Structure formats: structure tokens, C-alpha cells
Amino acid sequence: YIALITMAIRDSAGGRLTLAEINEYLMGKFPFFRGSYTGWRNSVRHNLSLNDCFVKVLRDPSRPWGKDNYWMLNP
């Protein structure tokens, strides 16, 4: 989950990213994940910030459809 998260966050470049898209492809890539329990987003996101150690935004005014998230990470 760590490595996966690493490559997931890698989507960015130490600037900003959307966990919405990250998780979007996460489940769209990992079948086992989409066939176990779609409730790890809590442990994933948790470790996400508890891993990289960046800053996120509490649902900013920029969510298409109404279910997105923007995170801001940097070195």
C-alpha cells in the first residue's frame, strides 16, 4: 500500500495532486482493491499524509461532478 501510494502521489511532482484521481486509478488499476472493501481510503489517505507529510485542502471550490479532492505536497 505504501509503494502503491508512492507511485500514486508520484502523479504530482512535489506541488499538488488530487487523491480523487489517485484513488480513481488506484481502483481502476488494482482489481483486488476494488474487490475487497472500498473503505481503505481512510487508512490510505491517512498513511498518505502520514507518509509523504504534505498539506491537503478540505474540499476546495473545484470539484467536477462533486466528489473530488485537492492535496498540496512539496519537498
Curated annotation (Swiss-Prot):
Where does it localize?
Nucleus
| Residues annotated to bind DNA | 1-75
Q: Which organism is it from?
A: Rattus norvegicus (Rat)
What does the function comment of this entry state? Plays a role in hair follicle differentiation.
Q: Which residues of the full protein are shown?
A: 120 to 194 of 399
State the protein's name.
Forkhead box protein Q1
